[PDB]
């Protein structure tokens, strides 16, 4: 069953985890697809996001450490979706 | 010396006693001690002078068994050439010898340090008597040095950026992109522009077209100066001395590229924030 | 001769041509749709002109007369059509020279010789060139189909693949069906 | 005097203009230096600027209609300079 | 097979191996230059040759896991390569 909701290969750890917690695991892997390896952000960033003007470093992987600055956040538009103006490793990026 | 022509020669050795030369490059277009334009090979040089200078490099470079990439520098006056210094490393303008000879200079370094013979299969350097030049390459370094303020480096935020390309244009990426803040602590180079063709005049026409197609706002820039140096008849002649900037007045003058697209944005911004 | 050049296209080839045009000191003009208002190509050229606020995205680059409108007011010399739009349109190539606008491409008849699937094949055989054997036009008889198979040899591709002859029967009818 | 001040050609119109209103003619030259030709801006934009989320077109030259959009404004930084996020001709421009 | 009376999308690679500017020549033919005159300056057919091998890739928003249906939306980040051996022809891709 688990090899069907996912993309194929499943580890035994996944199998025993589903049987202990059914909905928690189904929820976990869903968030895994959304946000990446969430456990890599520092606790203050994981809990509070980022303050305006702040730079923060995320050790995404061994030696891979991206330098993220939040420049400004916009007013919400119709449909209530704000635009977030990021500075990521020197370059500029917008997020909805 | 008097009214000469600065000319380098690119040699490459391996760790087995095999050294080849990818011919010369002209760097006589200099303002101060730093070089601003370098052409590969030299247009105004005779095939006899070019050979004696290249053989002079191979003589020195093999007598001491130099290994890996290097450069021997020569000044040239009339039929007489002399030696000044050696740069035992890559030069900023190796790209144009890469363009007209076909051999990847930086890559050949890496395999030489690994230990690959020059004429092995991984490098497959041509035999020396087969190395040649096809066409003429020109390299421009686009910097933030105010051509109208003693070439003092402008520091600030690039707010808009656009590179050119297409047939005959090779770019080497520096600190130039949209959003970069050029630090005052390093050489103020943004991007390495380098062209090529079958003539040195088609390369000039190609070079100015890309220098024009370039778009960098938010900071000053030496593009208009580099444009004048290109378009001047004293440069396209093929023969120019170290005394070329000094001899040419019309190079420094530059008409200021009116930043209509930005100035409009700047005005509306002021009256929106300040009323 | 060419003092100003208009590109009847968009995107990569317009930029491609502008770079080529401004290398020979040729003044360049671009056209754009309302959907290409934000396009990257319409400021690789000196000036840029909307095809007309009343045209959809594909209409803007195919309206021969309004394209001629924008070029005539641009007092342009030549037109490069690029590829994929009016690049080989003899009617555009006819309309251009009608207005003293040098159509950058082949002469009018060339567009005709190479415009259709059979006319090009015919000029190709006239110049002593090998050609894929085919039926002279379309056919609606097995008898002419077997006439071509025992003269062209297998395999054979029917449309509107057959190797063994026992298939040329059941395949020639299948296409006649779906084509019908 | 005027030719050297602008370091360029000068019409008679400039000459009588400066002769009639000197400290005024020269002040306008500073403004054409800073922002270019403002007369080409529509009157509402010239007086109030742009509102967040407003698309606007200004013809600055022959066949050179530049399409401008104001996306959002930032809170002022340490000095007092705000960041404006534009969308000129489909490509994003920022200016302080 | 067929003959297309127009320049082609894969023309870039033929320029790099041979050395001749195809689109440039196209303009100077309508300008009536002699194919072996100063302007076109074509080398004779014997002296036309190729050096090396060139390859071209048209990068598109065709999803190769969804029947090559051209995805659309907003590019929120764009970085281009370069250096020795690389030729780029800009199309529709840019930061925004
Ligand atoms: C001189 C030139 C190179 C621009 O120089 P300038 O004097 O600094 O700029 P202008 O005042 O003419 O133009 C400013 C704005 O006009 C706009 N613009 C330019 N050409 C345009 C066009 N064809 N359609 C719409 N808007 C255009 C852009 O928003 C440009 O802003 P940016 O250049 O700051 O990004 C001009 O001849 C030009 O059209 N440039 C764009 C095309 C180009 O780069 N050609 C080079 C050869 S490929």
What keyword list fits this structure?
part of a larger assembly; 5 chains; 96 residues; alpha+beta; four-stranded antiparallel beta sheet; 4 helices; 4 strands; 28% strand; elongated; binds coenzyme A; Pyruvate carboxylase (chain B); ligase; Biotin dependent ligase; Pyruvate carboxylase
In short:
The structure is cut from a larger assembly and holds five copies of chain A. By secondary structure, chain A is of the alpha+beta class.
Description:
The structure is cut from a larger assembly and holds 5 copies of chain A. Chain A has 96 residues and is an alpha+beta fold. In chain A, 34% of the residues lie in helices and 28% in strands. The first copy, chain A, has helices spanning 2-5, 12-20, 22-35, 43-48; strands spanning 55-61, 64-73, 84-88, 91-95. Chain A has a 4-stranded antiparallel sheet with strand order 1-2-3-4, with no helix packed on it. In chain A, strand 1 and strand 2 (64-73) form a beta hairpin. In chain A, helix 2 (12-20) crosses helix 3. The radius of gyration of chain A is 17 Å and the shape is elongated. Chains B and D meet through helix 7 of B and helix 4, strand 2, strand 3 and strand 4 of D. Coenzyme A (COA) sits between chains B (160, 209, 212-213, 215, 217, 257-262) and C (18-19, 22, 42-48). It is classed as ligase. The entry lists the keywords Biotin dependent ligase, ligase. The entry is titled "R21A Staphylococcus aureus pyruvate carboxylase". Chains A, B, C, D, E are Pyruvate carboxylase. The organism of A, B, C, D, E is Staphylococcus aureus. EC number of A, B, C, D, E: 6.4.1.1.
């Amino acid at each position: 069953l688990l090899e069907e909701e996912q993309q194929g290969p499943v580890t035994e750890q996944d199998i025993i985890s589903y049987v202990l917690y059914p909905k928690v695991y189904e929820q976990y892997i869903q968030t895994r697809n959304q946000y990446g390896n969430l456990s890599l952000l520092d606790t203050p960033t994981f809990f509070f996001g980022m303050r305006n003007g702040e730079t923060v470093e995320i050790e995404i992987d061994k030696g891979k450490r991206l330098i993220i600055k939040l420049e400004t956040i916009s007013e919400p538009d119709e449909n209530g979706n704000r635009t977030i103006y990021y500075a990521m490793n020197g370059q500029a990026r917008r997020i909805y | 010396i008097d009214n000469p022509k600065h000319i380098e020669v690119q040699v490459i050795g391996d760790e087995h006693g095999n050294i080849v030369h990818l011919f010369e490059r002209d760097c006589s277009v200099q303002r101060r001690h730093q070089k601003v334009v370098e052409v590969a090979p030299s247009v105004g040089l005779s095939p006899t002078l070019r050979q004696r200078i290249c053989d002079a490099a191979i003589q020195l470079m093999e007598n001491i068994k130099y290994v890996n990439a290097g450069t021997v520098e020569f000044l040239v006056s009339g039929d007489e050439f002399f030696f000044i210094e050696v740069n035992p490393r890559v030069q900023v303008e190796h790209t144009i010898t890469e363009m007209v000879t076909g051999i990847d200079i930086v890559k050949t370094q890496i395999l030489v340090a690994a230990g690959a013979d020059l004429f092995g299969e991984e490098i497959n350097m041509p035999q020396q008597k087969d190395i040649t030049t096809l066409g003429y390459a020109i390299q421009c370094r686009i910097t933030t040095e105010d051509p109208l303020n003693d070439f003092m480096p402008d520091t600030g935020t690039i707010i808009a950026y656009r590179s050119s390309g297409g047939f005959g244009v090779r770019l080497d990426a520096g600190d130039g992109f949209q959003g970069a803040e050029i630090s005052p602590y390093y050489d103020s180079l943004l991007v390495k522009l380098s062209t090529h063709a079958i003539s040195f005049k088609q390369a000039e026409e190609k070079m100015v077209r890309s220098l024009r197609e370039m778009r960098i706002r938010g900071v000053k820039t030496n593009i208009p100066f580099l444009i004048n140096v290109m378009k001047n008849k004293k440069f396209t002649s093929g023969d120019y001395t170290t005394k070329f900037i000094e001899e040419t007045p019309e190079l420094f003058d530059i008409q200021p590229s009116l930043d209509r697209g930005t100035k409009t944005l700047e005005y509306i911004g002021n009256v929106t924030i300040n009323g | 001769q060419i003092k100003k050049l208009l590109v009847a296209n968009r995107g990569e080839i317009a930029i491609r041509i502008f770079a080529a045009a401004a290398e020979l000191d040729i003044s360049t003009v671009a056209i754009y749709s309302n959907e290409d208002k934000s396009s990257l190509h319409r400021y690789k050229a000196d000036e840029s002109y909307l095809v007309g606020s009343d045209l959809g995205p594909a209409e803007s680059y195919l309206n021969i007369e309004r394209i001629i409108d924008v070029a005539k007011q641009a007092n342009v010399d030549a037109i490069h059509p690029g590829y994929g739009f009016l690049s080989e349109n003899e009617q555009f190539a006819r309309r251009c020279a009608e207005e003293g606008i040098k159509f950058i491409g082949p002469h009018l008849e060339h567009l005709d010789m190479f415009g259709d699937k059979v006319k090009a094949r015919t000029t190709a055989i006239k110049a002593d060139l090998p050609v894929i054997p085919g039926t002279d036009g379309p056919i609606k008889s097995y008898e002419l189909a077997k006439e071509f198979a025992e003269e062209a040899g297998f395999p054979l591709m029917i449309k509107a693949i057959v190797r063994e002859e026992s298939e040329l029967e059941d395949a020639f009818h299948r296409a006649k069906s779906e084509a019908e």
